[PDB]
Design a protein around this ligand. Structure first.
Ligand code: 3PE
Ligand code: 3PE
Ligand code: CLR
Ligand code: CLR
Ligand code: CLR
Ligand code: CLR
Ligand code: CLR
Ligand code: CLR
Ligand code: CLR
Ligand code: CLR
Ligand code: CLR
Ligand code: C14
Ligand code: C14
Ligand code: C14
Ligand code: C14
Ligand code: C14
Ligand code: C14
Ligand code: C14
Ligand code: XKH
Ligand code: NA
Ligand code: NA
Lengths: 513, 497
């Protein structure tokens, strides 16, 4: 008995090398079964999928596999695979990352978070709602991991202040602790879906949409925001109600208010750099939203059609961060000859942007884009579409429900970005076969791959929440089951009621054929 | 007194007042070409004056080209990751892997043992080695592999102004050496092969150009200009204590200890990367790239394939007895290089720099600026042929500081052929000097990817690179003219037509 356990532990210890070596051997027969080009493309796609799910290699490193394999297998030349990694979607992501780095550099995010928590209240239900709305709004522009990692200390400080008898009161104490510590990552994950720059899978959707359907241009920052933000708010409210119900039982408050006040005043008086960064971020968001909302002609209409994008706007905005002064200019500096000649500092130096930008996610997005390109050009997409004949009789709404459920179940064990990268061509081909708008199935999958609530390995915010040490896997799975159910239902509602008027999903687009 | 105040805010002053100074360019030449020229010059001056960080300037095409109609955003953006950048990225990750395991320390200490810490002997040896290896490979791969040794040596012999001065000089010696070495052979650089192809296209009867003739012509050029550049760099940068240095280097060398498994594994990966780079596709003997589809493979595939091994190959010696030893702990082994350290120690800024350079090239080639320059250079046909070839050499050497060597040679070579035909001079007299000049790129990071690879360290400023580049370009033009007018007349029999 002990020998079997020892052998299992030993083989689990070297899981990465074993899976790396044995995945290609297991995946040889798909090459023989399928036509050469299609078989090789499916082989490399499945190899990347398994490597991503198992984490045999770093996700960014696995994203570089097409460079090795597409030329070797003859799927695509190297000079065509390589440029896929910096499609304009990746310059949009990069502008969002630079803006987020500027926001975190001057502690603007902490100031906004503390202000919202001050405004919302201190009552446990009010505090749950305020912390969730704070994390959701703050993850719309920042990363989910950073938002969770910053909101955890604030929650711990607030609870320590609040709780600074028998079993009822202290059991309520643990219940409130669990509720606060679990409401942060779920809210971060929900709020990441509101904006394209909020999370990577939305940008995966953009890149693979430009790949599979070059003429599709109805998804941008404004349309995605107006579609997802109401859905984000509805899902956040549902999650708040559920979490307060299960945990919150739906002088101390003075102490919590005092501690949050003293935490806010620890930031000192607001700095000129803070106003500059906030105004730049507001201009960034407005310009991205108003570039082309598809129902008021944006400022991109008066320029040359088909030339501008969100990437150019984001890069243009974040360029100003690298030369705008961080100290208030004064005209009297010129006149005062005895004034010091100290060199001024920009709002964001490039060193900070270099060391506070996740280039690994950029490489992952690029790998997804290039894999989509290779799958399209190798003819694997049409092969999958032909093989999907038995599913042509499923009603489109039922198909959306099933694909959302499948992807939301799959994302509980793999990263959201890898999940959507793997599943998006399948959804594209299924939508083509069903004679329905491709976005009507792509967007459900893109949103639902972020519905990772049940496990710590589902999404790094959940990993941080578990690392807080006050949460159990049972609590997270119990909450996340209903979180996934409500998310799927609300997503179906959104895709069947108001996504139709936004993305014009009612009619099959002509560019889909 | 106000001069100090003005100089204190030099960056903002130049950033605001440079577009205004460059406005007359837009109206001088046709608008499609004028806007592209304006963008090119704006980026050049921003790089020279360091008004913006090198990458922020490198991101300028994203803003400029789509707004003024030069090139769509979805066409500008994919240029920042051409396959040339995947070759640079893999070289950077390999250099980081070498640095992490202290293999660079061992290599540099062995080099110091073989040579000594005598000033400028290191720079001469490293320069000649870089040129020799660049003889058969592309300049990009050669400099990408040579920067790790340069950083190793520099970090080793130095453990105040002299230290940084030698640092800058010995780093800048590498891309220049690669550019000098690549022009000596037909296989050294792409423009030579492009010249052969276009010559076969235009002049099938002309067959006096080949590997032997080109070597016997250009090897003296490479040696002469390499020695001249070595003297220039040594003089500008850096002009018994020696026994004590020898001794202490010795004791520290034996205090390194035995070579670890990780060090030799990384060294073998580096050697395999170099060999697969050389043997991928030589133009005199077919390489393993001929076993696959034509033109589907490149140095990027080799670099990424080799570097992928670094992220999973174990950093400790594996033993089969571990499986049988059930009492041994089941602790996972760290790979040769984790992605965290790679992301920490890779200059993505200069990935963006090469990208901006490629965008500049494509914007120039798509806006018609290159064709406009070729057409405007026409009236140079009313000058004696010696002055003609000298002016072609100088204009190409200055032009190639902005465009890549392949791009500029593709632009100018048909112009050179038609100028030679119209002027009634034997074509080679202008074909060869243009091909040699297009390799004379020493002033800007955009000029050639080796310059950006040199910039990778971050201690090298554009100002000193330009300072060396002026004299380097002038000396190259002088030597090329001397070669074409002294011994290239007989080798190619180009004195008669
Ligand atoms: C750590 C543990 C492991 C973690 C792994 C994580 C990822 C798991 C992903 C799911 C499993 C792999 C995908 C499913 C199996 C592979 C697909 C397959 O079976 O393809 C080959 C097969 C051959 O069918 P054939 O014999 O051609 O049918 C007769 C007409 N020719 O084709 C068919 O049967 C036709 C129908 C194909 C439907 C689509 C299959 C691919 C979907 C993903 C594409 C990307
Ligand atoms: C794009 C137009 C230009 C920019 C927006 C308009 C100008 C706003 C004023 C300049 C910036 C002020 C500093 C903002 C800091 C971040 C927000 C914050 O938390 O501010 C708190 C502060 C009020 O509290 P305070 O009085 O400072 O507290 C201590 C003293 N009792 O807050 C304030 O005093 C200012 C409150 C500003 C509220 C702005 C509300 C949104 C405006 C539209 C945004 C559209 C885009 C959204 C994405
Ligand atoms: C190494 C581990 C993780 C791999 C897990 C997935 C494996 C078991 C799966 C993925 C794709 C699968 C293959 C897909 C298609 C075919 C063709 C069919 O005519 C015979 C089975 C065969 C050949 C399957 C065998 C099992 C297979 C290789
Ligand atoms: C000032 C900062 C925040 C930039 C954002 C300004 C917004 C409000 C501006 C910029 C471009 C503008 C548009 C430009 C052109 C047109 C077409 C015209 O027939 C009606 C107005 C309309 C549709 C404008 C509406 C307002 C607009 C969208
Ligand atoms: C737009 C044109 C006409 C004028 C531009 C003037 C610019 C360059 C001037 C105006 C005010 C100046 C600032 C005034 C005060 C200081 C503080 C001191 O530590 C020097 C830097 C710094 C931050 C100056 C930087 C340069 C500055 C921003
Ligand atoms: C949170 C829950 C309880 C509310 C949302 C439930 C979902 C599943 C409901 C609400 C609105 C519904 C849609 C409303 C109307 C139509 C049009 C009909 O021709 C086909 C079904 C379809 C497309 C429905 C599918 C199911 C649907 C999306
Ligand atoms: C920012 C600083 C360092 C730039 C210095 C060089 C600038 C001022 C120079 C370099 C070359 C110059 C151009 C050269 C030739 C012409 C053609 C003439 O018919 C109008 C002016 C115009 C278009 C010049 C404008 C100014 C110019 C662009
Ligand atoms: C340091 C000196 C060389 C200036 C910097 C280099 C650039 C900015 C200069 C060098 C020579 C210049 C060119 C000289 C002559 C002409 C022809 C005229 O009809 C339009 C402007 C144009 C095309 C100039 C544009 C600017 C230019 C390309
Ligand atoms: C020593 C390690 C790194 C392995 C690499 C060895 C190199 C030098 C070997 C291995 C396989 C060889 C190739 C095998 C077959 C052919 C086809 C033939 O028509 C021309 C030579 C060519 C293209 C060979 C060139 C040299 C080659 C690439
Ligand atoms: C090729 C197939 C058939 C077999 C592959 C065996 C591989 C996975 C085995 C063989 C030897 C093993 C190593 C032997 C010893 C150790 C030290 C211990 O701390 C575990 C990790 C490490 C470093 C092992 C990692 C896994 C390993 C490399
Ligand atoms: C800015 C980068 C891309 C290129 C380097 C500067 C270019 C634009 C400059 C350098 C030298 C210049 C040439 C110098 C002299 C002449 C002769 C006459 O006919 C006017 C135009 C013409 C032909 C100029 C055209 C522009 C030119 C080619
Ligand atoms: C170790 C990660 C990379 C493994 C690559 C294996 C490639 C195998 C290709 C098999 C299909 C083509 C046969 C001609
Ligand atoms: C480093 C791993 C390299 C694997 C290369 C696999 C190549 C498989 C295809 C070979 C033939 C291509 C033309 C039909
Ligand atoms: C009383 C209000 C003071 C505001 C100070 C900060 C202003 C920052 C302006 C930034 C503008 C950026 C785009 C040009
Ligand atoms: C239609 C006018 C074209 C010529 C002027 C263009 C000016 C662009 C200025 C860009 C400045 C970027 C750095 C601040
Ligand atoms: C952020 C700076 C933007 C500068 C935009 C300059 C645009 C110049 C060209 C305008 C007309 C384009 C069509 C001919
Ligand atoms: C690696 C050292 C050089 C090896 C080749 C030397 C000879 C030149 C190529 C062979 C053909 C020469 C005539 C075209
Ligand atoms: C040659 C000296 C003895 C040791 C041989 C093995 C050293 C490690 C080699 C790693 C090679 C990795 C790529 C195949
Ligand atoms: C620019 C390019 C060239 O010279 O053609 C690179 C440097 C190469 O050596 O191939
Ligand atoms: Na986020
Ligand atoms: Na997930």
């Amino acid at each position: 008995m002990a020998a079997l356990a020892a052998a299992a532990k030993k083989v689990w210890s070297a899981r990465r090398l074993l899976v790396l070596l044995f995945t290609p051997l297991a995946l040889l027969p798909v090459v023989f079964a399928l036509p050469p080009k299609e078989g090789r493309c499916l082989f490399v796609i499945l190899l990347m999928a398994v490597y991503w799910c198992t984490e045999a290699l770093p996700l960014s490193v696995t994203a570089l596999l097409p460079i090795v394999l597409f030329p070797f297998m003859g799927i695509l030349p190297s000079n065509k695979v390589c440029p896929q990694y910096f499609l304009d979607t990746n310059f949009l992501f990069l502008s969002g990352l630079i803006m987020a780095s500027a926001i975190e550099e001057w502690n603007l995010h902490r100031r906004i978070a503390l202000k919202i928590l001050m405004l919302v209240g201190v009552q446990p239900a009010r505090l749950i709602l305020g912390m969730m709305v704070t994390t959701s709004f703050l993850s719309m522009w920042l990363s989910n991991t950073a938002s969770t990692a910053m909101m955890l200390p604030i929650a711990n400080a607030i609870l320590k202040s609040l709780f600074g008898d028998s079993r009822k009161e202290d059991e309520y104490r643990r219940n409130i602790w669990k509720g606060f510590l679990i409401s942060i990552p779920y809210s971060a994950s929900i709020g990441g879906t509101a904006t394209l720059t909020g999370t990577a899978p939305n940008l995966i959707l953009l890149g693979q949409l430009k790949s599979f359907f070059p003429q599709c241009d109805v998804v941008n920052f404004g349309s995605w925001f107006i579609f997802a933000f109401p859905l984000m708010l509805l899902f956040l409210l549902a999650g708040w109600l559920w979490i307060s119900f299960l945990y919150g039982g739906l002088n101390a408050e003075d102490r919590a208010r005092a501690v949050i006040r003293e935490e806010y005043q620890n930031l000192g008086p607001i700095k000129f750099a803070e106003q500059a960064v906030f105004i730049l971020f507001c201009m960034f968001a407005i310009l991205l939203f108003t570039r082309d909302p598809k129902f008021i002609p944006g400022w991109a209409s008066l320029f040359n059609p088909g030339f501008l994008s969100d990437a150019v706007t984001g890069v243009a905005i974040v360029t100003i961060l690298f030369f705008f002064p961080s100290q208030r200019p004064s005209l009297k500096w010129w006149f005062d000859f005895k004034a010091p000649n100290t060199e001024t500092e920009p709002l964001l130096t490039w060193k900070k942007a270099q060391e506070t930008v996740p280039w690994n996610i950029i490489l992952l997005l690029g790998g997804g884009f290039a894999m989509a390109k290779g799958c399209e050009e190798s003819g694997l997409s049409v092969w999958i579409g032909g093989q999907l004949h038995p599913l042509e009789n499923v009603p489109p709404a039922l198909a959306v429900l099933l694909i959302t459920v499948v992807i939301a179940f799959f994302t509980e064990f793999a990263s959201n970005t890898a999940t959507i990268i793997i599943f998006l061509p399948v959804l594209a081909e299924l939508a083509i076969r069903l004679r329905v708008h491709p976005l009507y199935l792509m967007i459900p999958g893109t949103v639902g791959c972020s519905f990772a609530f049940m496990l710590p390995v589902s999404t790094p915010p959940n990993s941080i929440a578990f690392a807080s040490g006050h949460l159990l896997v049972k609590d997270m799975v119990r909450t996340g089951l209903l979180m996934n159910l409500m998310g799927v239902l609300l997503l179906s509602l959104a895709m069947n009621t108001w996504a139709q008027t936004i993305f014009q999903l009612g009619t099959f687009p002509d560019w889909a054929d």
